[PDB]
Structure formats: structure tokens, C-alpha cells
């Protein structure tokens, strides 16, 4: 089966590059869509972006397009998140998502997730 695990720093200063890691186990990286999802406490879920495995094609939310860049590492079974110049509104619970279907907005799989707090 496909298992996901988030692993990122929990406390980052504002106006700093946020780097978060989701590792993939049980399946290859190159034949499924890979997705980041945020979830601010006291609010709801919001889209971040996605990457395809063997192609490296990225589609991102237009509002955050200027500050979200997604890269993947096929050797480490790895795909990553880069968020530049974080603010206090970027404090959210972060999920990495994957699906049984090769590409679907709905995600069959989901990591436990990691909490990121932006404060001084």
C-alpha cells in the first residue's frame, strides 16, 4: 500500500523560505500525482499545488503561484515543498496527498501531516 509521512520544522520565522518534506513508501514516485494541502486551524482546507512524477509538470494556485515551487527527487522517492517569504497567515496544518488513480483531485492516500506555526 501507499504510505505518506510529513517531516518539516514546526516553528519558522516570518519572511523565511519554508521547506517541508513528504516521503513516499510502498510505490514508485513516477506514476502518480503528488499533492500538498494546507489546513489553517479555525478555517478550512486550501489548495497548494501538485506535481507529476516522470514529467515534472506543476500546476499551482494563482494566488500562491509566485511563492510556491515544487521539485521532486526520484532517487530518494521524494517530492518537496518550497514556500518563500512566509507570513502569519501561512500558519497551517500541512498535508501531503496521493491517489490510487494516476491523476485525480480527490486523494485516496494522505500523510498524518505536520503543524507549522509562523510567529516571532
Amino acid at each position: 500500500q501507499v504510505q505518506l509521512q510529513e517531516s518539516g520544522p514546526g516553528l519558522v520565522k516570518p519572511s523565511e523560505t519554508l521547506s517541508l518534506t513528504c516521503a513516499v513508501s510502498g510505490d514508485s514516485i513516477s506514476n502518480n500525482y503528488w499533492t500538498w494541502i494546507r489546513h489553517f486551524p479555525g478555517k478550512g482546507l486550501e489548495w497548494i499545488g501538485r506535481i507529476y512524477g516522470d514529467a515534472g509538470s506543476t500546476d499551482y494556485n494563482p494566488s500562491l503561484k509566485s511563492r510556491v515551487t515544487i521539485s521532486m527527487d526520484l532517487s530518494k522517492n521524494q517530492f518537496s515543498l518550497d514556500l518563500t517569504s512566509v507570513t502569519v497567515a501561512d500558519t497551517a496544518l500541512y498535508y501531503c496527498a496521493s491517489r490510487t488513480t494516476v491523476a485525480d483531485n480527490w486523494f485516496d492516500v494522505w500523510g498524518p501531516g505536520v503543524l507549522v506555526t509562523v510567529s516571532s
Binding site: 478550512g44 486550501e46 489548495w47 499545488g49 500546476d59 483531485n105 480527490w106 500523510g111
Partner: protein, 107 residues
Amino acid sequence: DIQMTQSPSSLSASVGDTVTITCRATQSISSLLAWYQYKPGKAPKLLIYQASSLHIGVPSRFSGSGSGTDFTLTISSLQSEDFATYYCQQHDSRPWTFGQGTKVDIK
């Protein structure tokens, strides 16, 4: 961007009752909708895909319907394990959006 107005925001009900939660979209999105069940301290799980179809493992008691802009989920024979947050999600426009969340709680 197609925006969402989740219905209703809150509803307290006991075990065995029937609660209906509506899903209204600002634009005609045909019947491409998916619903989620958020458990606190855990990742949300898919219950209904395609606005009428059941994910394997999900209870049959859960039945969603609707097309175009108006959608409903009917939760018949409510139990203790499914007091959660309800979230319908469309997959037409990029990127996908969410509701404001519907809270159900034990009366």
C-alpha cells in the same frame, strides 16, 4: 473561481436521527463533486465521490445526490463514530476549493 457556501454551519443531533447537509456551487459544475469526513487529530477520509457514488469501505447508509449547482448528502441512521466535519469538494476548476465546514455534535 467558483466559490462555496457550506450549509448548514452547525447541527446537533442524537444517535439514529437523519441530518441533511446541502452543497451549493456558484456555477454549474455538473455532478463532479467529492465529500470528506474530517476526524480531529487525523487526516480526512473520502466518503462519496462523483456526487452519488460510494467509496469502497464507506457505509451504504451514506447517500449523496444532486446535479448542476444544488447538491445534498443524507446521513441516515446516525451513529457515534461519524460526528465529524463535512466538506464537499469539486474538481472542475483549477485549483479546487472547499466549504466553510459543517459541524455535527452529539445532542
